[PDB]
Every structure is written in structure tokens, then in C-alpha cells.
CSV table of C-alpha atoms in Angstrom, one decimal:
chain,number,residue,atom,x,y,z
A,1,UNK,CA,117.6,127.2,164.3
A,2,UNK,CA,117.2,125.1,161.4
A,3,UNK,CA,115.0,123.1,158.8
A,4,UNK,CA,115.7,120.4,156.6
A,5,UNK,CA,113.9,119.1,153.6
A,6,UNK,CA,111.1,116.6,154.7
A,7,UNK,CA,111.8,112.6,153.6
A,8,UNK,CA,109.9,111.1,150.9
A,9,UNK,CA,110.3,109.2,148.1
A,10,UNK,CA,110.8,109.4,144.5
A,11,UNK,CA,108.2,110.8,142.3
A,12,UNK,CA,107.5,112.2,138.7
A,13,UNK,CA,106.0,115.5,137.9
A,14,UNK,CA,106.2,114.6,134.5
A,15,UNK,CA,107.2,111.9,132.4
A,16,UNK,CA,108.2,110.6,129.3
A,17,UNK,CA,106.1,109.9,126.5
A,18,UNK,CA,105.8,108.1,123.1
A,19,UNK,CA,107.8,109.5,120.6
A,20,UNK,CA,108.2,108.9,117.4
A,21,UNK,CA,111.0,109.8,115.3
A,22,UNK,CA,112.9,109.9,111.5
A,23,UNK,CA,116.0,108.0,111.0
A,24,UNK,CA,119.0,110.4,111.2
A,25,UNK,CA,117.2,113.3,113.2
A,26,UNK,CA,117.3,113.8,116.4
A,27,UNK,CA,115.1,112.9,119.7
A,28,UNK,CA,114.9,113.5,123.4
A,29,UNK,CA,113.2,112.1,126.0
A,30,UNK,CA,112.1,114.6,129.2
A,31,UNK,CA,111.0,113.9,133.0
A,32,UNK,CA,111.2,115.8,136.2
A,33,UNK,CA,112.3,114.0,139.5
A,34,UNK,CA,111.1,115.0,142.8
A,35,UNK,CA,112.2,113.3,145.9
A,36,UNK,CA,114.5,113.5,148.8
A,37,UNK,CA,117.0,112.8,149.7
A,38,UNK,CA,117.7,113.3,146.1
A,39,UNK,CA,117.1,110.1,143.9
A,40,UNK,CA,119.6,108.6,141.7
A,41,UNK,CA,118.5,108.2,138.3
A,42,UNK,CA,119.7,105.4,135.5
A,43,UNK,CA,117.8,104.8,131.8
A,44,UNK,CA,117.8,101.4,129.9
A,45,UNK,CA,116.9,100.7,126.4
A,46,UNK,CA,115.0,97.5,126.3
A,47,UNK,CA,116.0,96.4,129.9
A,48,UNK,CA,119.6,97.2,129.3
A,49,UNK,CA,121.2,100.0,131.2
A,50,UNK,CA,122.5,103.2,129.0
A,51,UNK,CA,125.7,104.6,129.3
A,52,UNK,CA,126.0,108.3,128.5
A,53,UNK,CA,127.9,108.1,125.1
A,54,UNK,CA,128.0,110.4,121.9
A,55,UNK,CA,125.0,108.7,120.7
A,56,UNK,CA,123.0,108.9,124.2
A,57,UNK,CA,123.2,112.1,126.1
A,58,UNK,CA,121.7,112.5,129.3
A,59,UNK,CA,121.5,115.2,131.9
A,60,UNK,CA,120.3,115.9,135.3
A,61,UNK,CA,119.6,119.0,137.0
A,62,UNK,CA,119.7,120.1,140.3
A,63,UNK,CA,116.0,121.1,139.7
A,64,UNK,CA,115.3,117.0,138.8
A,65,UNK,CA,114.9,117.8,135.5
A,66,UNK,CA,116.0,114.5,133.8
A,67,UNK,CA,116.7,113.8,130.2
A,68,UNK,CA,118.0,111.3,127.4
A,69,UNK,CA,119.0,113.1,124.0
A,70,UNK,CA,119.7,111.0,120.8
A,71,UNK,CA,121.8,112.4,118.5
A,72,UNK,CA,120.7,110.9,115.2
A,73,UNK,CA,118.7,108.1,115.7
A,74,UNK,CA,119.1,104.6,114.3
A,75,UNK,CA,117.1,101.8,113.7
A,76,UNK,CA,118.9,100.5,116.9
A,77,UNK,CA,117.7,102.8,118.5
A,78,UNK,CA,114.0,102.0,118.4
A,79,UNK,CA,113.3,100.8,121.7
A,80,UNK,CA,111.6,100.8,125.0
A,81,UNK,CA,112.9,103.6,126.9
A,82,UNK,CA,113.0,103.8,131.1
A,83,UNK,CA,113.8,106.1,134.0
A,84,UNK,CA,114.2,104.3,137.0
A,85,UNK,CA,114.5,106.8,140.1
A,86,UNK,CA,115.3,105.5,143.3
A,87,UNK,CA,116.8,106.9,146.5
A,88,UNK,CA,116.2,105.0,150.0
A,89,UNK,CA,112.5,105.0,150.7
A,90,UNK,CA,112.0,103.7,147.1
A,91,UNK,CA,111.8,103.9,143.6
A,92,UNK,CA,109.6,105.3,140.9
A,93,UNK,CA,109.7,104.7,137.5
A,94,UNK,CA,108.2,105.7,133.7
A,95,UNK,CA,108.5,104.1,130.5
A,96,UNK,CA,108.4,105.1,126.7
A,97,UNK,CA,108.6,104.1,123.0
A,98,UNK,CA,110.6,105.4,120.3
A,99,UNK,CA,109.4,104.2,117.1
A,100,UNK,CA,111.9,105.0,114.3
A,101,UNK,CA,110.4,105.6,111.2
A,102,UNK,CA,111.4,104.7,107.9
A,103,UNK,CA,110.1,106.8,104.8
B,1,UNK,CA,125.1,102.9,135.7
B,2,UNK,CA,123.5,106.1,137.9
B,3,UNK,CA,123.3,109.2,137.4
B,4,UNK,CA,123.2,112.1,140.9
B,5,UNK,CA,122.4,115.7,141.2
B,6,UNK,CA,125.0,118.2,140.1
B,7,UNK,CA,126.8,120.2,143.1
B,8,UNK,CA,125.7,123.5,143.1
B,9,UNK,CA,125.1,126.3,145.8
B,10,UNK,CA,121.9,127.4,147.0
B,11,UNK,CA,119.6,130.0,144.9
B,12,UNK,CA,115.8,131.6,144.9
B,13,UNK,CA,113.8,131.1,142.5
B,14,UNK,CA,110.9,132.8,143.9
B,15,UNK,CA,111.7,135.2,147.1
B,16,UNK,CA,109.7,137.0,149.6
B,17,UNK,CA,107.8,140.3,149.1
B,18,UNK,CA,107.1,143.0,150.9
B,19,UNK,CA,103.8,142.8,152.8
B,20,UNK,CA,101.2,144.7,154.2
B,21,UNK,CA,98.6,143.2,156.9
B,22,UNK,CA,95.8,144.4,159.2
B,23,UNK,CA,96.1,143.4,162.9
B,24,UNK,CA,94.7,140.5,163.9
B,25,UNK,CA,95.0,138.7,160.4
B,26,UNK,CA,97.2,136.8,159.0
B,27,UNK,CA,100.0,136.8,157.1
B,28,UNK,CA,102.8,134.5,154.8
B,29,UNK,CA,105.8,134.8,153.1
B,30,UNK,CA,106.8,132.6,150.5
B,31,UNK,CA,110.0,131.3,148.8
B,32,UNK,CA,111.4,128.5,146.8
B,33,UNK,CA,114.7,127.1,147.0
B,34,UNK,CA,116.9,125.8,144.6
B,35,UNK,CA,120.3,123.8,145.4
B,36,UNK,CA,122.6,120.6,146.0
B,37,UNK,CA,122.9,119.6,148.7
B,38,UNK,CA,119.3,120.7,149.5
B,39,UNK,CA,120.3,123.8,151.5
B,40,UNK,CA,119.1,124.3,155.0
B,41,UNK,CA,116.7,126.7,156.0
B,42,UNK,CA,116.1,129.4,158.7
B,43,UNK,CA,114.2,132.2,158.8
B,44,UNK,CA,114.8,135.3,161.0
B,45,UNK,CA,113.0,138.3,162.5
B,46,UNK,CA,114.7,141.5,162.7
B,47,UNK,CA,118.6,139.8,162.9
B,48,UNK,CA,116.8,137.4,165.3
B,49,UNK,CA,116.1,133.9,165.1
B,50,UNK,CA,112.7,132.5,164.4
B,51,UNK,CA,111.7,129.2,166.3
B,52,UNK,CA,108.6,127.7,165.0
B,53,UNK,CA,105.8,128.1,167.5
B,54,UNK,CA,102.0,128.5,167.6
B,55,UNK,CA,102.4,132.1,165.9
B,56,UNK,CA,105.4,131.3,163.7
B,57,UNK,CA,104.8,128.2,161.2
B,58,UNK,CA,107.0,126.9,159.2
B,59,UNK,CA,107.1,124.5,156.0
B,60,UNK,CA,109.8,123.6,153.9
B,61,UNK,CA,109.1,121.0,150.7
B,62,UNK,CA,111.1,118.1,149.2
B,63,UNK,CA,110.6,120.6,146.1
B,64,UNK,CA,112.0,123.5,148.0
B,65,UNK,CA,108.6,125.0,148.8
B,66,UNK,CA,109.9,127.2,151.7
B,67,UNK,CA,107.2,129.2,153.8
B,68,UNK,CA,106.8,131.0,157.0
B,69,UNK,CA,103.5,131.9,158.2
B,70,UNK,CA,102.2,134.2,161.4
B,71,UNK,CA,98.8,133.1,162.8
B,72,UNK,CA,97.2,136.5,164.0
B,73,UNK,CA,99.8,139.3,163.2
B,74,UNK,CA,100.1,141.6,165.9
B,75,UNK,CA,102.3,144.8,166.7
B,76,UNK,CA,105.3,142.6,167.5
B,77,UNK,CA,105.1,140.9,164.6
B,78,UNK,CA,106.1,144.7,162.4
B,79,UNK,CA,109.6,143.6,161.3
B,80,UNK,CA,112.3,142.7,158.4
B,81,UNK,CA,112.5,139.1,158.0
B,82,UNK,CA,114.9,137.2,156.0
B,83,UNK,CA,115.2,133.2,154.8
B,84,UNK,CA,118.7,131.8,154.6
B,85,UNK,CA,119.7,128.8,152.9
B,86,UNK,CA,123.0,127.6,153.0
B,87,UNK,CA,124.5,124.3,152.3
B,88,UNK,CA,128.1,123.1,151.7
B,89,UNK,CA,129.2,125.7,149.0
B,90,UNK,CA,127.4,129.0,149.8
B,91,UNK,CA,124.6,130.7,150.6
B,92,UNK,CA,121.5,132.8,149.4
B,93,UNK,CA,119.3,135.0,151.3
B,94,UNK,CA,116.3,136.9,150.7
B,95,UNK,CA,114.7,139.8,152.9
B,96,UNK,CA,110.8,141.0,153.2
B,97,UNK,CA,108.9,143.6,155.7
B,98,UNK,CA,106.3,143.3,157.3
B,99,UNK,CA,104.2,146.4,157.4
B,100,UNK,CA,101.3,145.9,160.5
B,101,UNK,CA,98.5,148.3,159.5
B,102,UNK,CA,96.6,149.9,162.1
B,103,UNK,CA,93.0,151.4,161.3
């Protein structure tokens, strides 16, 4: 006798918003994916993908929770920031700024 | 570049209490469930299995909202009852009683 999660596609509980930031600290951007089966989930800076590097630090739990850590942000780094979530019935997607401010 | 779910086995994050109901009302358990694979689930009734019918309903979320309720609880319905989730690397089980109050 058994059940199996129903089928639907991605959606976000919560996600991402504007940021803004100081040159050398540090920032991080937060969502939460639901869906199933379970979405895949890719970031882009400016609509260029991010690879998980020192500098960009991203995680993603079994609970959906979805993240994108900078470790001390640049002025590169001032961007557009994305979370595309997709999985076979579709796709879902947020977007966000990081504005890097200068004193 | 895409990130996916980490593996891990299934876990409660909320589990089923003990209950008390009048006759003739009715009555629900409720669980969550956490895990990757999404786990499967089954719920039983006294080491017995329970197939969903007109007195046993059964829900189970794409955010691992897992429920069982009994339409009219009658004297049959006074037993243990336990949710099992289990997917590729384990298993996690919760247990509840149902206590059917006569006045």
C-alpha cells in the first residue's frame, strides 16, 4: 500500500530580493523551491550561468531551501541575480539586484 | 551548470499525536516529511495496512504534507496507527493512538 508525492511544477515560497551591499563584506541571496519531482536549480549573474567557486557559494537543501553566498563582494559583482528552477512540467524563476556600494 | 537535491534518508519534521475523539466525529493525524528521494508513504492501523477508502483519506504533498483522516470514527476505528516513509537509504516512522470516547 503505497503513496507517492503528487506531480507539479516548480514554485517559490520565497524569493530573492534586492540587496544591497559594501565592497569587501559579504552577501547572500535566499529562496525556497517547492516542486516535484524535485527541480534542478542553476543561478546566473547577468544572463551568465554561475559556477560554485570560492567567490560564489551556493547550496541546496533537501528542504528546497536555495542559496548564493558572496564571499566579499566586488564591484564585479554588482549584478542581476537569477534562480531558474525547472524540473519536467516546467520552470519557475526569480530575479534580484545587488548594488555594491562605494563609500 | 545545475544544481540537484542532496541524498538523504527520510525524517519527520512534524509527527502524529496522540488523539482523543467522540464517536461519530471525526478525526486526523498529521505529519510532514522530509527526504531525497521523496520517500514513500503508508500508513497502517494496528500492524495492518491502510487502503484509502471512504472512511480512510489520505493526502500526501509535493511539500511533504502527509495526512490521514477518518470520516466518522467509530469503535473499529480505536487503534495505534503509524506512517512509514521509506526511500532508497532508510526509513522513519512515527506512531499515534487513537483513543474513541464513549459518553
Amino acid at each position: 500500500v503505497a503513496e507517492e508525492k503528487p506531480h507539479v511544477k516548480p514554485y517559490f515560497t520565497k524569493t530573492i530580493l534586492d540587496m544591497d551591499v559594501v565592497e569587501g563584506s559579504a552577501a547572500r541571496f535566499d529562496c525556497k523551491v517547492e516542486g516535484y519531482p524535485d527541480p534542478e536549480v542553476m543561478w546566473f549573474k547577468d544572463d551568465n550561468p554561475v559556477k560554485e567557486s570560492r567567490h560564489f557559494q551556493i547550496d541546496y537543501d533537501e528542504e528546497g531551501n536555495c542559496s548564493l553566498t558572496i564571499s566579499e563582494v566586488c564591484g564585479d559583482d554588482d549584478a542581476k541575480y537569477t534562480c531558474k528552477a525547472v524540473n519536467s512540467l516546467g520552470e519557475a524563476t526569480c530575479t534580484a539586484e545587488l548594488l555594491v556600494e562605494t563609500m
